[PDB]
């Protein structure tokens, strides 16, 4: 998108975890070791 308000792709998601998309180009976001799954990106959890 023009703004860019994602995270960028050159920041890791935490370890143990992956990212996906939907059909439709929606990304979500899984924690293996729990076997959790969220559409809130984790890695704005470590934002100032």
Same mark, same amino acid.
């Given at each position: 998108?023009? /703004?860019?308000? *994602?995270?960028?792709?050159?920041?890791?998601?935490? @370890?143990? =975890? *992956? /990212? @996906?998309? #939907?059909?439709?180009?929606?990304?979500?976001?899984?924690?293996?070791?729990? +076997? #959790? #799954? #969220? =559409? +809130?990106?984790?890695?704005?959890? /470590?934002?100032?």
């Amino acid at each position: 998108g023009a /703004m860019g308000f *994602e995270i960028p792709d050159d920041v890791p998601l935490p @370890a143990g =975890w *992956e /990212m @996906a998309k #939907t059909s439709s180009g929606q990304r979500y976001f899984l924690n293996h070791i729990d +076997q #959790t #799954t #969220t =559409w +809130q990106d984790p890695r704005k959890a /470590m934002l100032s």
